[PDB]
């Protein structure tokens, strides 16, 4: 929803998710992207523990 407010749609690809929109993705939004990716990875690991 944040990306769509900024004008990007989340196309999931499994190992990593990307965002489609007009022009390059902005720095804060791309940063949100990798932080949610690492958060999902850490969530899986912490689910295991």
């Amino acid at each position: 929803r944040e990306a769509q407010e900024a004008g990007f749609a989340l196309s999931t690809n499994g190992e990593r998710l990307e965002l489609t929109g007009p022009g390059p993705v902005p720095a804060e939004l791309s940063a949100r992207l990798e932080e949610v990716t690492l958060g999902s990875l850490a969530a899986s690991a912490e689910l295991e523990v």
Binding site: A27, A31, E34, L38, G39, A42
Partner: protein
């Protein structure tokens, strides 16, 4: 014994260090770094094109 417990905390601080690489600040700095480096790369590539 106090040094032992403190160093145990420091050894467990590796988890905190790893967690420090997933909040907005550090990885937004990382996105800025990689964005500048890439935009330089495509700048050279387009100049050659």
């Amino acid at each position: 014994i106090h040094l032992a417990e403190a160093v145990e905390g420091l050894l467990l601080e590796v988890n905190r260090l790893d967690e420090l690489f997933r909040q907005g600040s550090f990885l937004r700095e990382k996105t800025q770094l990689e964005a500048r480096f890439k935009e330089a790369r495509e700048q050279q590539l387009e100049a050659l094109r």
